[PDB]
Design a protein around this ligand. Structure first.
Ligand SMILES: Cc1cc2nc3c(=O)[nH]c(=O)nc-3n(C[C@H](O)[C@H](O)[C@H](O)COP(=O)(O)O)c2cc1C
Ligand SMILES: Cc1cc2nc3c(=O)[nH]c(=O)nc-3n(C[C@H](O)[C@H](O)[C@H](O)COP(=O)(O)O)c2cc1C
Lengths: 216, 216
């Protein structure tokens, strides 16, 4: 049951540094990242997956100053995922997307690919040209990917914590992501909680359905 | 297996208007909405769940003009979820979150409730006062709930389609959201696909791991 997963999953505060993902688990987490939906199948994202001790330490440099209370969550977890959004929607990306969809067998005629390209360009152009918000639109898709990921890892029986408390300017410099066209948004350390994770045994808390839902 | 769900779920293009969700499935989808994580447990959201023919036709008035192609997805689904974000983060909201956490038994230490509220008001004030993007930070949390939702509903064996192609100003005017401090961002019809849902038997397409993942 997925609902039991939803009620049991928690934001891990401390990871066991001796528990690592299997090679099968490492492959499956990467499948989850790749297969999330996105508006127009635009997939405007890049992911850093750090599993080495050198790589996690480099990600862990961004939990500087005020974000030092999240550094140990990055170093003790098995795999650390960095979710990055594209910084602008370019026309090369859109043609990369429609060429992948043709290569995957989604179009039956050249008119069906041209129709799909036109339709995606129009909605990319509403954000790029009309609203001037393509940066915010692509970042919103990366957060939907985070949502998908947290539930999926929970359903695999693993522990994780979504981190917004890190320095994105520090992280983007280290991996040289502005040169590559991307910016870091959320860091998700993945592994197994330890006995020091105080949040594992505390109750879940959410606003009641009376406040947050309207039925019509 | 959750990886099977991720590879099997699709964006439905046509729903079977005779197939409805059971009362148990209706309750489970509201549990999925409420239990999604969000930064600092801010839960900066409101959900409209329309299951009646009158309710769904009111949501379908936003599938206007250029967006007429999404109208039928809203009309024939069993349940239509409107994901709304708060338009500003007020102190009143943060207080009801911390009081709910208090009632749920999260702070065994009355000094920890006060410690946690001011940390939440500190990270909410870095967006509503310092960075001035409180509306984008709260919309970001609503897309994380949408990603959580779409994988969960696929894990329950239901069909859905995330919709961005709707007129949010019509949708907000129709349900008086602007005066309640909420704005609609994503519409998600849930139900069971028709025999004429062409997308159900098309192959899934995504960019390769070689483009989207960097391993470190
Ligand atoms: C976008 C996002 C960012 C978060 N950032 C942090 C963080 O920097 N550090 C942390 O300890 N937890 C962080 N969390 C945890 C939230 O406090 C948490 O999801 C929320 O309190 C609900 O608890 P649950 O995850 O255990 O269900 C973050 C969560 C989200 C969704
Ligand atoms: C945020 C968002 C908005 C979308 N808006 C629309 C829409 O307006 N109409 C539609 O038919 N599909 C829409 N979709 C479906 C996307 O085209 C689809 O998710 C994508 O092609 C990947 O296909 P899949 O969901 O079948 O895996 C949307 C998806 C997302 C995530």
């Amino acid at each position: 049951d997925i609902i039991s997963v939803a009620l049991k999953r928690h934001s891990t505060k401390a990871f066991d540094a001796s528990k690592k993902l299997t090679a099968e688990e490492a492959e499956k987490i990467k499948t989850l990242l790749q297969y999330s939906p996105s508006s127009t199948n635009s997939q405007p994202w890049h992911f850093i997956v750090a599993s080495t001790e050198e790589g996690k330490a480099r990600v862990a440099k961004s939990a500087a100053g005020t974000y030092v209370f999240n550094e140990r969550k990055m170093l003790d977890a098995s795999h650390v995922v960095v979710f990055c959004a594209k910084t602008a929607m370019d026309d090369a990306w859109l043609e990369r997307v429609v060429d992948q969809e043709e290569a995957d067998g989604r179009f039956n005629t050249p008119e069906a690919k041209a129709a799909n390209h036109k339709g995606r360009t129009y909605f990319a152009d509403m954000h790029r040209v009309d609203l001037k918000d393509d940066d915010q639109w692509m970042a919103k898709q990366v957060y939907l990917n985070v949502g998908n990921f947290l539930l999926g890892v929970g359903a695999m029986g693993l522990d994780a914590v979504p981190i917004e408390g890190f320095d994105a300017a520090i992280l983007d410099e280290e991996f040289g992501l502005k040169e590559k066209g991307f910016t870091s948004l959320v860091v998700v350390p993945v592994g197994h909680h330890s006995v020091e994770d105080f949040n594992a045994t505390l109750p879940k808390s959410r606003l009641p359905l009376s406040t947050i839902v309207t039925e019509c």
